[PDB]
Design a protein around this nucleic acid. Structure first.
Ligand SMILES: [Zn+2]
Lengths: 112, 17, 93, 252, 77, 91
RNA sequence: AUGGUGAACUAUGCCUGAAUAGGGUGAAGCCAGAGGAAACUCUGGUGGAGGCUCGUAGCGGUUCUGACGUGCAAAUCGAUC
RNA sequence: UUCAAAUGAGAACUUUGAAGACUGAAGUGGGGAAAGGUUCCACGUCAACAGCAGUUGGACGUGGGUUAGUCGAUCCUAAGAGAUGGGGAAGCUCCGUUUCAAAGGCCUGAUUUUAUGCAGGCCACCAUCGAAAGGGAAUCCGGUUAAGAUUCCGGAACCUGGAUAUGGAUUCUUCACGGUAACGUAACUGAAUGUGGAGACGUCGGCGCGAGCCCUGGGAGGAGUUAUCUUUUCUUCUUAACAGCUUAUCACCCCGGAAUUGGUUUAUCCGGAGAUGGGGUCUUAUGGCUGGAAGAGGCCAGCACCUUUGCUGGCUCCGGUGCGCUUGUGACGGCCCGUGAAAAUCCACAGGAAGGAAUAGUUUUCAUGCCAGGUCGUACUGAUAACCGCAGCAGGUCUCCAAGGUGAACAGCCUCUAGUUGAUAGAAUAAUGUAGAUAAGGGAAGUCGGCAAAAUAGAUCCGUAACUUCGGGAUAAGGAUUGGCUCUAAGGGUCGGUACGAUCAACUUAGAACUGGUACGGACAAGGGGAAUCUGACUGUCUAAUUAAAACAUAGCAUUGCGAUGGUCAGAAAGUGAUGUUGACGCAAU
């Protein structure tokens, strides 16, 4: 049966003026301004949120340690950990294909 | 001026023809 | 508190005290949601307890989805009936 | 009198295009050394919808031949182009859907779209959804190629102009009726302020040459001469015939 | 606003050359279901955070008080 | 139970817009909401969104096609008249 | 006629935000059952579609040609819509 | 509105107490934006003002009051605005915003003449202005004033910028290990350049979860009622930012190889492109425990006593419930010829340029320690008296918080918290009025005209025509039932087993007796209907302040112009523009 007011000068229900009702140690209801929630980082080509990376605001990523923003595997904090393994098959097979196509070209001018 | 003092336009009042 | 105590016994609930529709007082979707969540939960715990097999569970999951099982007591009578005729066929074949 | 409605559209105050949600200018890759002596490979990265357009756009990424970077161009997606497909642009490209070739090397009867008028303008002809041109003849001398335009005109352009093989996706869009003014309100909400349109016969004489009178009628002939004056051109300008034709449709 | 569970690490914080004020708080609590007991809380004020150590045994409560250095100002209750 | 006799998906429009205009939309609204087989993964997971764009539910392949159909009949002849003309270049 | 001032009211476009109880009707998709040689057709549910509908806040201003008409008001008040 | 007292020369109007009432929480409550500018607070005053009065006042006179590294501005960019280079114009000035321009400085190396000349390489982005509702580094709790606070005080935190030190870690295999894997850790060199992510997004629908509120049980205190009854009614029992550990839907990994197809949502999607199952990984919105933190705050008791006024004891506990209300969020589904901003900023990866150990070095992305954080706004009203309307005007003006009962309901009605009792009064009850009502018999005979008024009204059950674009018409039309009380039946959760009990918690529906002055949606609330004609298809829009319509618009249909050296239109001119970030399924004109 207790009502509460805004704690700042903004009187409108914008996206940056969310309110959570919090019971204080004084025994009364009081509003608390909450921040906009962070979004998990996404992979560069598959669109899924890669795991092992903390979900924070971009400028508070410079305060957390190194281990919260990367994975020990190469292309750690950029790819989907199946995106890495997909471009290894492609990098190994094409270069193996590019050298067996070079010896097929050699077959032409050496026997015509 | 206001809604009163009507003399001009009229349905069947003054200022006809 | 005295008026709410009499409503638990069934008083003050006749046709002269209803001003909204039957769907307005209690939606039909909530009754249907309550019906499936009892039938699906009972049917899932019978598969885990060994009282029913996965082939009979699959044909009862879809049967309970449409109709013919209006409460839990109707489903357990069909399960026993579907298990009683299953053992007489095996004993004769 | 008063300045009539179509004269006010040239000032460009409230009649300008709404270009907030547009993805950019859909232009072909600029003509460089690689596209007139060989070909270059590009990847279809993402196909997206363009606001105010009926045909979707395609994000195609090429490699810069002179510096280590990536260049993303804005193409008009043809029907059949999918993501992850290799796009070959240049003089020595093959005849596949989505490839960009000079139209002086394609055979007669090729279905191409996004055709340059002059070599270097990065696509001028056949850009709407479901539209295409057909190469009808080749002149090896003077490097001139004859094509047919979607309106049926038979133009001749240079053989060095480029064009994307295939037909533009999103065809058959105008086949569905809108069924209401609400769907027509949203269609023109992202193009320009030109809807709804008030008839000129139902307005005042100051607002239109057709206005006025005790009955809703034009009064004079609705066919306006070509050498008229801005303010008089309201109706059928330089019409050579009128009425509905009870006969065959557009000629060959 | 930080809790310390090690008593050997607690003694190192009292000789950090910057802590000047320490407080001991006696709390009247009770056990699982029976008699009340005496809970103590040793709080050391640092330069960026307040470290505290809670001992639920009265036998070790008195022993830790004499182990504190005398240059540290202890505030009883 | 079949709820409606002939209106089908156009029963949301009520008694408005006329019967003939509601029948042409019914022919195109069924096609634009139907599911289609993916040529790459073989699954019937292609759905329409942002007309002219046909995305596979899984398989992440996005194919540009017609406004209400994946492959229009006017574009199928285009896909065959270029394949026929391509074979004459090398042969 | 000459030279200046105004879109704080209002007209329209754009940009960035905000606001809109509770009911009625029951479109596609889906499930189960029944009939039939087939084609398929019916029955019971599910689902929640609409420039749909009743009706608050809101917006509007039909009628009483009511009140007022040197008014509370140079356009308001009441019922009704 | 009433009574009494106080003050005063003077009281229907001031103050206090008592009584009766209202606003009923979409408020006459508590806060803000725009706007006002001292109206805020105290003391003194009553000539004028408060259309009566006045001891009172938003009045008059004299003073007091607004405290920030964390709240905003400042910064970024949107629609746009607008210098320079140039081109027009007699000219005031106009065009144009990266445009026909020789458009600029960063990490450093070289230098121990002194401060930066000078050697590379790099990057061509090329003014600036534009949001106190967009984007955005970082604070909470308690106490405090006559009037101020997230700003003061006390306690407890966090961010940015800059210095360096101590401890740790790594290095003689120079620039770390473990896990099959997803990945994990207190740390664990990375320049030019390139790439990616966050910032960064529509609406509606149901479902899951969380928070606050509502409801409720036991217990520990206080208050109310008591002719009678009532283990009764009311009230108190609270835990911030931040820190550590832990915790889930989704997602992913390993083993394994599925038809006698299985799994599974309220809503039918998934599986040899590897399901079910078994074992794991990660995100930490949120929740849980602990620290912060009882030392606070709250509720009482026992004392002191003109007094600065305190002092001493206690308790502050353990639970339950949900189609509940508000709100946050998660995974989904529907809709589009509508697919629903940008930039500053921050991070990661790719890359291997450089710099480095052995009697010694490197990392301030590990821990701790040090210093600093400027300028301006901050009072009050935000409206039947502080804003705009000539005013202390029944008008107009954006938004947040939302108790209990009745009921479908944020409807109407009553009450709690909170706030008002302010609109000149007194005495009588003629006519005529304004507002609200009731009428015997007839039932539109009234009137241009059923104008006005009346009747109908909720829910449940029955029944429902012509016509039709087959979707409707339809709540068609037309009937019946409705209270109270006593019962019956049906619809669930949790626990030990290859069978059944025990226990616990919900308002939903149906049925049967009894009962009454035949009343029962008992106040409130709440469709008149049918048969046809003219006309416009419908939703929608306009003459602010006499005309809301058959007028306008609309989808549909048709015609015309135009292939860019172009169509239509603008400008005094222009190296000028709109359509055009456009290309005939287009634009422009009817
Ligand atoms: Zn696929």
């Amino acid at each position: 049966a207790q009502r509460v007011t805004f704690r700042r000068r903004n009187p409108y229900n914008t996206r940056s003026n969310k309110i959570k009702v919090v019971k204080t140690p004084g025994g009364i209801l009081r509003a608390q301004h909450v921040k906009k929630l962070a979004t998990r980082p996404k992979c560069g080509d598959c669109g899924s949120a890669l795991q092992g990376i903390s979900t924070l605001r971009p400028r508070q990523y410079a305060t957390v340690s190194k281990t919260h923003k990367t994975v020990s595997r190469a292309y750690g904090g950029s790819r989907c950990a199946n995106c890495v393994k997909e471009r290894i098959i492609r990098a190994f097979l094409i270069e193996e294909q590019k050298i067996v196509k070079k010896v097929v070209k050699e077959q032409t001018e050496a026997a015509k | 001026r206001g809604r009163g003092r009507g003399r001009g336009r009229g349905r069947g009042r003054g200022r006809g023809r | 508190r005295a008026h709410a105590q009499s409503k638990r016994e069934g008083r003050h609930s006749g046709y002269g005290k209803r001003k909204g529709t039957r769907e307005a007082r209690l939606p039909s979707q909530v009754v249907w949601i309550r019906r499936l969540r009892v039938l699906r939960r009972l049917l899932a715990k019978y598969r885990d307890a060994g009282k029913i097999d996965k082939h009979l569970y699959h044909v009862l999951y879809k049967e309970s989805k449409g109709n013919a099982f209006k409460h839990k007591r109707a489903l357990v009578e069909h399960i026993i009936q579907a298990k009683a005729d299953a053992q007489r066929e095996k004993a004769l074949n | 009198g008063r300045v009539i409605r179509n004269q006010r559209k040239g000032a460009g105050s409230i009649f300008t295009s709404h270009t907030r949600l547009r993805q950019g200018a859909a232009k072909l890759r600029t003509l460089d050394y690689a596209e007139r002596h060989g070909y270059i490979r590009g990847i279809v990265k993402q196909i997206v919808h363009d606001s105010g357009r009926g045909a979707p756009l395609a994000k195609v990424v090429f490699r810069d031949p002179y510096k280590y970077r990536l260049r993303e161009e804005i193409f008009i997606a043809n029907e059949g182009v999918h993501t992850g497909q290799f796009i070959y642009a240049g003089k020595k490209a093959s005849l596949n859907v989505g490839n960009v070739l000079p139209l002086g090397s394609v055979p007669e009867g090729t279905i191409v779209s996004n055709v340059e008028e002059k070599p270097g303008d990065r696509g001028a002809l056949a850009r709407a959804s479901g539209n295409y041109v057909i190469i009808i003849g080749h002149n090896p001398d003077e490097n001139k190629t004859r094509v047919r335009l979607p309106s049926g005109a038979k133009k001749v352009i240079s053989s060095d102009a480029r064009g994307v093989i295939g037909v533009i996706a999103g065809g058959g869009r105008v086949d569905k009726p809108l069924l209401k003014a609400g769907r027509a309100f949203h269609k023109y909400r992202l193009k320009r302020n030109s809807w709804p349109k008030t008839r000129g016969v139902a307005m005042n004489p100051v607002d239109h040459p057709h206005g006025g009178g005790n009955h809703q009628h034009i009064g004079k002939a609705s066919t306006i001469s070509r050498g008229a004056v801005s303010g008089q051109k309201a109706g059928l300008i330089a019409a050579r015939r009128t009425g509905l034709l009870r006969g065959s449709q557009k000629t060959q | 606003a930080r809790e310390i569970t090690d008593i050997k690490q607690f003694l190192e914080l009292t000789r950090r050359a910057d802590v000047k004020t320490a407080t001991v708080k006696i709390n009247k609590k009770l056990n699982k279901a029976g008699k009340p007991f005496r809970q103590t809380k040793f709080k050391v004020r640092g330069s960026s955070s307040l470290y505290t150590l809670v001992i639920n045994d009265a036998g070790k409560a008195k022993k830790l008080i004499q182990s504190l250095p005398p240059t540290l100002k202890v505030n009883r209750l | 139970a079949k709820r409606t006799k002939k209106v089908g998906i156009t029963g949301k429009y009520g008694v408005r817009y006329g019967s003939s205009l509601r029948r042409q939309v019914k022919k195109l609204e069924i096609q634009q909401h139907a599911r289609y087989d993916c040529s790459f993964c073989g699954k019937k997971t292609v759905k329409r969104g942002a007309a002219g764009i046909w995305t596979c539910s899984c398989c992440k392949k996005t194919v540009a096609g017609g406004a209400y159909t994946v492959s229009t009949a006017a574009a199928a002849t285009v896909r065959s008249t270029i394949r026929r003309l391509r074979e004459m270049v090398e042969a």
